[PDB]
């Protein structure tokens, strides 16, 4: 081999390690700077489009990492021992790549689960608010200003409405849990001035209770008014 060619190989190993290491460091700086525009499906999948671009960038560096490990395990053995320090730096850079790749996988995983949860949020919210708007727009005359047949007719309608309310009460529980999980996975991506889906949970729960209480009061008023017609 030769001391000249040995040092020229050792130095090539240093060169490739410094070059590869800063390329990986660049990828991880870019990862941290991605963030998230809004807690919406369009914004989340823009975040994921960017993570996937960077995943492909790390992939293009896999073969360089692997050639680098090659060089490091085949380095000449000097009396100095300096090959051992350069090998340790190279093993570091390889672990850096594995860590960066794991980071990207974790971000992509949490994007996936936020996307499933946003889907579930809009499906549950549609179910609930259309039930709530349906009852919320139907007329409600004063029970005091109603005839006996009309009281009977409206009371029957309000039992149907109550039974549907009882049925979707599970959906109310499901959407509360979905919002809780959405906060958890969303805080991993960005710091939010105000908690992202906590306002939303409170608003939907508040509407649901308002319409339930209103409908229950209306029901008992219908019954009291009906009692006066004997």
């Amino acid at each position: 081999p030769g001391s000249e060619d040995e040092n020229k190989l050792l130095e090539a190993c240093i060169f490739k390690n410094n070059e590869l290491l800063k390329n990986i460091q660049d990828v991880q700086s870019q990862i941290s700077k991605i963030g998230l525009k809004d807690p919406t499906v369009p914004a989340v999948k823009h975040r994921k489009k960017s993570l996937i671009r960077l995943d492909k960038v790390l992939d293009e560096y896999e073969e360089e990492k692997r050639h680098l490990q090659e060089m490091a395990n085949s380095l000449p053995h000097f009396k100095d021992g300096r090959e051992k320090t350069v090998n340790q730096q190279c093993q570091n850079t390889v672990v850096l790549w594995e860590n960066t790749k794991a980071l990207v996988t974790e971000c992509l995983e949490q994007c996936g689960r936020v996307l499933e949860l946003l889907k579930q949020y809009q499906n549950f919210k549609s179910i609930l608010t259309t039930l709530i708007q349906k009852e919320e727009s139907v007329i409600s005359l004063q029970a005091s200003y109603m005839g006996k047949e009309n009281l009977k007719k409206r009371i029957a309608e309000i039992e149907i409405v109550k039974e549907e309310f009882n049925e979707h009460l599970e959906v109310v529980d499901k959407i509360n849990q979905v919002c809780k999980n959405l906060q958890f996975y969303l805080n991993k991506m960005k710091t939010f001035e105000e908690p992202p889906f906590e306002k939303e949970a409170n608003i939907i729960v508040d509407r649901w209770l308002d319409i339930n209480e209103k409908t229950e009061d209306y029901y008992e008023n219908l019954g009291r008014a009906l009692a006066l017609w004997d």
Partner: protein
């Protein structure tokens, strides 16, 4: 067999998924108090050391900071021979009691509505709750709130009494039963229906608490200035209007309170106190009119057969 956290500091905002996804490993340790900080930093969890405890993975058992070798002998099963760090039940029920004693308006309403779910989906919270005067809390808010706040409190309470420990807690808490009898005089027909059927599950769970019920009614009658049982018979006199339904619940309650009592001397005591108020006139008057529904009629003749 491996360790993981769950952030449950706010019980009104539990995330559901334990992290990390791929559990870090630790396998042995044998006192636990001194050993929990090592794992709390192994995880770097946003959970206050202090107020932390460890729960076994499939079973849910919360470890006593004692021995691994004694909790061993308590309980793992066969798998070991081939785990979540979270907040103490103490600390979580304290946050619950805090929220209830310190909030108002819309927050309060939301929280009471959530209690049902919180207790339903973490069953083990209910005993510690009873241990922390949680019932005193519920009543001491409910006795001052409108019928809507009260109906949420009652849904939570019925959830508690589905569990044996919650049932025993109310068997200890006289104020609860007193409040339910007071609630049989509510102007909300929903609140009355709910209070009554809670009083029914209360007297149906055991038999020894028929006397507990009869005493609660006597105690409230004495404080309030009214005759004993005025709320039940007031419901019987359909002053709000017809309610076959409420009547059936009320009469079945008075029936199985009678049928579960050895004292014929206390039984004649209570049946006097109530035919005094018009019970027999009501019974015959309902037994006549054929608008009476079969369920109800069946139970009124049960009363009369007792007499």
């Amino acid at each position: 067999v491996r360790v993981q956290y769950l952030e449950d500091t706010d019980p009104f905002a539990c995330a559901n998924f334990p992290e990390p996804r791929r559990a870090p490993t630790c396998s042995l340790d044998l006192p636990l108090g001194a050993q929990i900080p090592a794992v709390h930093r192994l995880l770097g969890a946003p959970l206050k050391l202090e107020d932390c405890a460890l729960q076994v993975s499939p079973s849910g058992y919360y470890l006593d900071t004692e021995l691994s070798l004694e909790e061993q002998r308590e309980m793992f099963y066969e798998e070991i021979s081939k785990l979540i760090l979270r907040t103490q039940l103490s600390v979580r029920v304290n946050a619950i009691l805090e929220k209830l004693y310190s909030s108002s308006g819309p927050e309060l309403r939301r929280s009471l509505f959530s209690l049902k779910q919180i207790f339903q989906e973490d069953k083990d919270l209910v005993p510690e709750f009873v241990h922390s005067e949680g019932l005193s809390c519920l009543i001491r808010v409910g006795a001052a709130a409108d019928h809507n706040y009260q109906s949420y409190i009652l849904r939570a309470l019925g959830q508690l009494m589905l569990f044996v420990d919650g049932m025993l807690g109310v068997v200890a808490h006289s104020d609860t039963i007193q409040w339910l009898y007071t609630l049989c005089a509510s102007l909300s027909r929903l609140v009355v229906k709910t209070a009554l059927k809670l009083l029914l599950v209360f007297v149906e769970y055991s038999e020894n608490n028929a006397p507990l019920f009869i005493r609660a009614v006597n105690s409230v009658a004495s404080t309030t200035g009214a005759p004993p049982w005025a709320n039940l018979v007031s419901i019987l006199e359909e002053k709000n209007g017809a309610d076959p339904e409420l009547l059936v619940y009320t009469v079945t309650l008075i029936n199985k309170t009678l049928a579960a009592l050895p004292d014929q001397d206390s039984f004649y005591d209570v049946t006097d106190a109530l035919e005094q108020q018009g019970m027999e006139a009501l019974v015959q008057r309902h037994l006549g009119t054929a608008g009476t529904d079969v369920d109800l009629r069946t139970q009124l003749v049960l009363y009369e057969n007792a007499l």
